[PDB]
Write a protein that binds this ligand. Structure first.
Ligand SMILES: CCCCCCCCCCCCCCCCCC(=O)OC[C@H](COP(=O)([O-])OCC(O)COP(=O)([O-])OC[C@@H](COC(=O)CCCCCCCCCCCCCCCCC)OC(=O)CCCCCCCCCCCCCCCCC)OC(=O)CCCCCCCCCCCCCCCCC
Ligand code: HEA
Ligand SMILES: [Cu+2]
Ligand SMILES: [Cu+2]
Ligand SMILES: [Mg+2]
Lengths: 63, 70, 70, 63, 28, 83, 201, 50, 57, 115, 100, 55, 128, 115, 122
């Protein structure tokens, strides 16, 4: 269903945002502001996730 | 609380107990593993009781309005 | 005075997550069927921390949702 | 329509697929993102698919 | 009012870096 | 332990199947970790003989004690019947 | 006049499918990839995620989860009995006397709506998840009440207060206050932790 | 005696003691009061009030 | 379902933030509550950044 | 006596004296109002019990004022304590007051002490 | 307050019994939130534009007397204290039954 | 026009040269960035849990 | 704390209730107020530690002075510097956007107290 | 005094300018429109009669009332024999309808609340 | 908040407009102040139109006045349009003055509401 597909897409967004936040060590308690270095790390993590998913989609469409 | 939630609880317990038995040594099955599973079940039940007691106690001792003491 | 079934289930879910996290943190399953004094102290501390964190997390989520209104 | 069981099975397959892929990505990604091998990701995903295919009849069942 | 150093965007520095090498501002 | 009639029979069965599905995913991750499947040294897309044997041991262990442990937890928790 | 080019796209589904970090959903492998015993499914069943939050959403959907219960009815916990433990029973009642742990369905629905609005707008920026109305909000406060008074300006984050000296001559001591180190205090720091609450009468 | 009045001016008038204290609104008037005998004295209001 | 999406969001927020904050298993203080709030804010902002990059740069 | 009655003693009616005493008590209270339940009379245990520093000024103000005027002044005190309005935040009239011998910069050395 | 059309049938998807994201309607016959209980009727019609005054065509309305001869969507929206006056003035839907 | 702004511009240029000589490439005090360069204010402020004072 | 007579129970209830005025009034918030990010608890403790360090230096001098006028003069001289620094801190904390900015301002204020405040206090006390 | 209250007819004032729903107003149940009903001032034990008329005896015939150019106070002025001669039952006109002596004393004189 | 004194700059048109749109739409402003600014906007608008229209009518009459009607076209036009210019200026000035006086009253109410004036407290 279209609603189910949208739900899965948003859940995937949440899961991989959490994964990038954990991998970049963004979550800290000393202050609530994410520095520009951490924002760059998060964006690079998101870019790598996007590239990996493009590769996987192409491979599975070929197969 | 629907009974299925209890079933859900069981699942978590099983998962935890599994990690305590075969988490490191992936051996075969015997009565020793059954005894270890029963030990883990009892430990998890006691830990759940303790956590429930302390959680509810702390969240109920937080003041929320004027003291009555009728 | 009146608690919904959903709110009771949410309380049970709070207890479930607190119990799982305190079992993992305090190694409460590494026993002979009964908890140790050190394990009991660690479970008490972890349960109190979970109570505080649950209160703060619920307040933060409600304040975010309400800030959408404001 | 009448394929309610088929729809539920399709949802289960999609969710398991995505969860296994996320597990492999979390396990394989290195250096706060920006470093992962696409072929290694695909191989891990296939191996985890085989493992879950063996596990699903054992665990995922009714009654 | 003062802008905090972490919230300070060095726009003056950005323009300074874009200047030619033989520039009066670089001489200053 | 306070039990109520909330979900229907089919809905209860589906929720049980859903938690079994997520338990299956968790056990998939568990057997993968315990059999050294998740490593960067792997350069192939197939399971080796040792990995297959360890996975078979994991499946056997899951098979032997799942129902028994669920029954034991159900007896220990002792949820009162819904009326 | 304001709607001329405000809403470019209306389909969230297309943007989700072409941009979300998930594998393509049209693959034919999702039909018989794995084998499960699903019993009989005579109704459209939907799956919920996170392996811990599915039951909360399943209970939220159901209408029988909103039947109010008295504590004497729900006087039990999954591994603990509360009818024989009076202290824990009272703490349990106090726990459920918090408005943040005992909310009506309307509060949870509003919170879920606003959180989903936040998620969609921060992810897609599609501008259709926001409220269509433009709300102008003004505070109407009854200033003619002596029981509650607001704070003109604010109670500032920090105030340094001089301790008065010589107000007491009972034993020829002009320092009313002394800290734990034993040193007499001349100044005090007062903080305003909550910037919006009223000041008690 | 701190004499005051809620609404209008009254007069606490004790004839036996020969004293009269004017209770005036907004005026907290301090009077000294000394009675040098055991006595039950009646009195009235000596300012027109209604 | 949208409520399920928000429930997953909130539960993941609490899980990750409490794992980070409660690291030494010491009893909490008031500043520990404030640090948990800071970690939750960082989680929300990290989600904003990552999702915004995912859809377009 | 902290605030003397002799400041306004020619007047039998104590209204300016009432205002003066209440103002002094309100200054003292603005210093100590939020520490009362932790360091002063309103502590839970008598171990940490201490008399509130403004007790004498409070009783003097109560003596000088009737309950009606005291209620008016308490309404003003609430209005000024909600906003945390210390009088020193607004006071400037000392710049438009005639100089006096008591206004010397060396206030401690102005007094001559003698046995 | 008559019944123009029979109320719409309840959906067969249990996840559709929540308030809609955009319309805000809950298709729940027994809604736990009493203040959010709505009954939805589904109509089909044709979009038509509003009318204008043409005195020579004998389409003139006296608002004060209550005599109306042409569809003045602006006045109709104002008199009924409706909210989206512009989206009311733009057009209106003429209900069309299928065959009879 | 030159008479009005000659001294004002001399002071501005002198300040510019002084802060370049001191190698100050940071923005001056009264610099008000546009909307995109500003820091959004964090709305979500959660007050700490109220607890009774032991003393 | 349970076992006590009626009078003791009433006194305990009174003492408890006199401390929950902050609890009761936290629900009544105003929409039109200008909110600010408050000073964090650790920064509050650091500022109070700096104040206690200042009080450590002044204690022997003020306790060895037998004139109230001298002690009041010492209090006034320090208070002007402290009030200027407090005004700077209040401005920079009210105009703060995140907790990082509030922490920066509180750290600047504490560093001013611990660096220049002690020097100024020592000079004053040497004068006295 | 029932003839004085013009709030009774306020519902008619709405449609003096808004004719639109005047016809809808006219199709309404008649309860007290252009009529005065006086509630029972006496206990009457007559089960045969459901409703009793307590109209004043000097207002029963409108033929005499319509052409008389005077207010309806003639129906209220000394029409009962019930007198009560008790010094303590004097319900005066109003407690505030007094004077403050030939020396106008304040705030007694300068306030409508008291005079 | 505004500087006070003889040497200070008077409120410019841009400042008045910005303050008006601040008081009308911003939060931190009570409902009464915003309603004051709204009532200022509603009632002031009549005077500009009224002045312009009265000036137009008077100028139409003045273009045919006993001496104006016999003037050359340039002088006749100038003398005829003088009443229109005067009344149009009167209408615009009255509208601006009424609106700004009420808006400045609302601004004073806002300043006292948030305690943003020294030497003013309850
Ligand atoms: C108040 C004025 C009352 C009318 C008045 O006194 O008219 C005198 C005037 C006669 O005075 P006059 O100087 O002996 O004769 C003027 C010459 O005929 C030579 O005629 P004129 O060229 O001087 O024009 C007559 C003159 C003066 O006429 C007016 O002002 C009359 C305007 C209408 C009044 C109604 O101007 C106008 O009529 C222009 C009026 C433009 C609008 C104002 O009366 C008329 O011209 C007829 C008025 C008819 C009114 C109806
Ligand atoms: C002009 C001054 C004047 C006069 C003449 C009178 C006349 C009288 N007064 Fe009056 N009285 C006052 C001045 C006066 N009074 C005042 C100021 C008050 C205060 C009011 C208040 O308290 O606020 C007062 C109040 C007052 C009270 C107060 C009631 C109360 O306090 O409870 C009483 C009661 O005993 C009283 C008694 C009398 C009596 C018995 C007479 C009798 O002597 C009456 C005698 C009658 C005459 C004197 C008539 C004169 C004869 C003529 C026909 C004149 C025409 C002749 C020629 C043209 C030459 N008076
Ligand atoms: Cu009297
Ligand atoms: Cu009297
Ligand atoms: Mg008198």
């Amino acid at each position: 269903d279209k609603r189910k597909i949208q739900h899965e897409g948003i859940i995937a967004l949440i899961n991989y945002s959490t994964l990038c936040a954990q991998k970049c060590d963004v979550l800290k308690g000393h202050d609530d502001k994410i520095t520009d270095t951490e924002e760059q790390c998060l964006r690079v993590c998101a870019e790598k996730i996007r590239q990996t998913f493009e590769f996987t989609n192409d491979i599975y469409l070929k197969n | 609380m629907d009974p299925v939630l209890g079933d859900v609880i069981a699942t978590r317990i099983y998962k935890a107990c599994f990690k305590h038995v075969y988490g490191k040594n992936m051996k075969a099955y015997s009565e020793k593993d059954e005894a270890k599973f029963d030990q883990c079940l009892t430990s998890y039940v006691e830990s759940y009781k303790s956590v429930t007691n302390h959680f509810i106690t702390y969240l109920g001792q937080l003041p929320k309005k004027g003291l009555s003491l009728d | 005075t009146e608690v919904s079934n959903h709110n009771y289930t949410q309380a049970v879910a709070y207890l479930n997550r607190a119990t799982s996290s305190c079992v993992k943190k305090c190694d409460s399953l590494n026993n002979n069927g009964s908890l140790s004094s050190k394990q009991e102290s660690c479970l008490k501390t972890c349960a109190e921390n979970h109570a505080i964190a649950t209160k703060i997390h619920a307040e933060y989520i409600r304040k975010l949702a309400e800030s959408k209104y404001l | 329509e009448d394929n309610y069981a088929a729809d539920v099975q399709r949802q289960f397959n999609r969710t398991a697929f995505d969860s296994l892929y996320k597990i492999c990505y979390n396990s394989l990604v290195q250096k706060n993102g920006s470093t992962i091998d696409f072929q290694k990701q695909i191989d891990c995903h296939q191996r985890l698919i085989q493992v879950f295919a063996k596990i699903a009849p054992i665990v995922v069942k009714v009654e | 009012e003062m802008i905090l150093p972490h919230n300070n965007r060095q726009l003056a520095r950005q323009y300074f870096d874009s200047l030619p090498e033989n520039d009066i501002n670089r001489k200053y | 332990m306070s039990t109520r009639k909330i979900f229907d029979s089919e809905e209860q069965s589906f929720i049980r199947l859903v938690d079994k599905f997520y338990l299956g995913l968790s056990l998939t991750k568990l057997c993968a970790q315990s059999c050294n499947l998740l490593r960067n040294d792997i350069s192939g897309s197939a399971l080796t003989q040792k990995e297959k044997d360890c996975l078979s041991i994991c499946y056997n262990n899951i098979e032997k004690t799942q129902s028994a442990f669920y029954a034991k937890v159900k007896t220990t928790m002792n949820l009162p019947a819904v009326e | 006049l304001s709607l001329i080019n405000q809403y470019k796209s209306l389909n969230l589904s297309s943007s989700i499918k072409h941009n979300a970090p998930f594998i393509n959903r049209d693959l034919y492998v999702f039909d018989d990839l794995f084998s499960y015993n699903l019993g009989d499914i005579t109704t459209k069943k939907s799956l919920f995620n996170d392996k811990n939050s599915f039951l909360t959403s399943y209970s939220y959907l159901n209408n029988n989860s909103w039947n109010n219960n008295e504590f004497d009815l729900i006087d039990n916990l999954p591994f603990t009995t509360l009818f024989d433990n009076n202290d824990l029973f009272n703490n349990y009642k106090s726990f459920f006397q918090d408005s943040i742990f005992n909310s009506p369905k309307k509060q949870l629905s509003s919170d879920s709506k606003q959180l989903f609005k936040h998620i969609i707008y921060r992810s897609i920026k599609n501008n259709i998840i926001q409220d269509y109305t433009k709300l102008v909000k003004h505070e109407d406060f009854d200033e003619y009440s002596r029981w509650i008074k607001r704070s003109p300006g604010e109670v500032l984050p920090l105030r340094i207060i001089k301790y008065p000296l010589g107000l007491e001559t009972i034993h020829n001591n002009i320092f009313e206050n002394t800290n734990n180190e034993g040193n007499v205090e001349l100044f005090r720091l007062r903080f305003n932790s909550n910037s919006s609450k009223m000041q008690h009468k | 005696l701190i004499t005051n009045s809620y609404d209008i001016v009254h007069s606490w008038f004790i004839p036996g003691l020969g004293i009269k204290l004017d209770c005036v609104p907004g005026r907290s008037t301090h009077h000294t009061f000394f009675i040098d005998n055991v006595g039950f004295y009646y009195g009235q209001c000596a300012e027109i009030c209604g | 379902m949208e409520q399920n999406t928000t429930q997953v969001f909130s539960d993941l927020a609490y899980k990750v933030c409490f794992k980070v904050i409660n690291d030494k298993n010491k009893p909490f203080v008031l500043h520990d509550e404030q640090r948990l709030a800071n970690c939750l804010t960082r989680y929300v902002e990290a989600f904003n950044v990552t999702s915004e990059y995912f859809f377009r740069e | 006596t902290v605030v003397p009655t002799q400041t306004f003693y020619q007047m039998q009616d104590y209204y300016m004296l009432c205002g003066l005493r209440f103002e002094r008590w309100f200054r003292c209270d603005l210093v100590y109002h939020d520490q009362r339940h932790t360091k002063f009379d309103q502590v839970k245990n008598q171990k940490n019990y201490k008399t509130y520093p403004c007790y004498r000024e409070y009783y003097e103000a109560q003596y000088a004022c009737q309950d009606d005027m005291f209620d008016f002044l308490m309404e003003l005190a609430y209005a000024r304590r909600a906003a945390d309005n210390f009088e020193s935040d607004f006071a400037s009239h000392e710049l438009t007051t005639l100089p006096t011998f008591y206004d010397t910069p060396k206030a401690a050395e102005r007094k001559t002490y003698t046995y | 307050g008559g019944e123009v059309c029979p109320p719409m049938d309840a959906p067969t998807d249990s996840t559709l019994f929540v308030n809609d994201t955009f319309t805000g309607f809950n298709p729940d016959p027994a809604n736990p939130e009493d203040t959010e209980q709505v009954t939805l009727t589904e109509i089909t019609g044709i979009v038509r534009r509003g009318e204008q005054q043409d005195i020579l065509a004998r389409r003139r309305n006296w608002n004060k007397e209550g005599i109306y001869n042409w569809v003045d969507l602006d006045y109709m929206g104002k008199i009924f204290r409706l909210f989206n006056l512009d989206a009311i003035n733009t057009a209106y839907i003429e209900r069309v039954v299928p065959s009879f | 026009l030159n008479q009005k702004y000659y001294t004002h511009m001399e002071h501005l240029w002198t300040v510019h040269v002084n802060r370049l000589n001191q190698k100050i490439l940071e923005d001056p005090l009264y610099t008000f960035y546009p909307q995109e360069l500003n820091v959004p204010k964090h709305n979500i402020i959660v007050p700490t849990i109220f607890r009774d004072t032991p003393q | 704390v349970e076992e006590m007579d009626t009078i003791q129970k009433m006194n305990y209830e009174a003492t408890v209730n006199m401390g929950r005025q902050d609890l009761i009034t936290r629900e009544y918030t105003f929409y039109s107020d200008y909110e600010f990010i408050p000073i964090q608890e650790d920064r509050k403790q650091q500022m109070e530690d700096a104040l206690n360090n200042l009080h450590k230096i002044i204690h022997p001098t003020v306790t060895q002075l037998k004139k109230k006028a001298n002690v009041q003069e010492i209090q006034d001289r320090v208070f002007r510097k402290l009030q200027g620094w407090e005004g700077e801190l209040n401005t920079c904390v009210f105009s703060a956007k995140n907790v990082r900015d509030s922490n920066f301002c509180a750290d600047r204020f504490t560093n001013r107290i611990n660096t220049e405040g002690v020097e100024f206090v020592k000079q004053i006390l040497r004068e006295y | 005094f029932p003839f004085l209250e013009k709030m009774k007819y306020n519902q008619y004032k709405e449609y003096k300018n808004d004719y639109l729903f005047y016809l809808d107003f006219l199709k309404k149940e008649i309860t007290d429109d252009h009529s005065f009903f006086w509630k029972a001032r006496k206990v009457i034990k007559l089960p045969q009669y459901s409703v009793f008329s307590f109209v004043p005896l000097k207002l029963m015939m409108w033929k005499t009332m319509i052409n008389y150019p005077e207010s309806f106070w003639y129906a209220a002025s000394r029409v009962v024999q019930s007198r009560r001669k008790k010094v303590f039952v004097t319900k005066c006109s109003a407690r505030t309808l007094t004077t403050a002596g030939w020396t106008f004393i304040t705030p007694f004189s300068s306030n409508i609340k008291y005079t | 908040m505004e500087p006070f004194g003889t040497d200070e700059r008077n409120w410019t048109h841009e400042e008045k407009d910005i303050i008006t749109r601040f008081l009308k739409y911003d939060k931190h402003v009570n409902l009464k102040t915003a309603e004051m600014v709204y009532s200022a906007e509603v009632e002031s608008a009549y005077f500009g139109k009224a002045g312009a229209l009265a000036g137009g009518v008077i100028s139409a009459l003045f273009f045919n006045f006993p001496i104006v009607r016999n003037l050359p076209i340039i002088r006749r036009s100038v003398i005829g349009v003088l009443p229109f210019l005067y009344c149009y200026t009167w209408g615009k000035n009255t509208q601006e003055e009424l609106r700004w006086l009420k808006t400045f009253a609302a601004y004073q109410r806002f300043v006292v509401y948030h305690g943003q004036h020294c030497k003013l407290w309850v």
